[PDB]
Amino acid sequence: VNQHFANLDDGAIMAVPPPPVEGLGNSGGFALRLQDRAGLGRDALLAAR
């Protein structure tokens, strides 16, 4: 599917195998939340992103 819809002209299509354990996330791998413990602002947070 990813090879097929790699040249899709309207948006993005991504196929991800489901996470091994239900309820521990929406996909397998790593989950990281990039916080702003100081209040740098939305633009600064996107910059860090």
């Binding site: 040249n7 899709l8 002209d9 309207d10 948006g11 993005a12």
Partner: peptide
Amino acid sequence: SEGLQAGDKVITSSLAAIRPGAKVIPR
């Protein structure tokens, strides 16, 4: 109203997957 001239080849697809200056294939 401005910034376009007749005959300009504008891309109307895959705008989410193109960066400035990247090479693309017209259809």
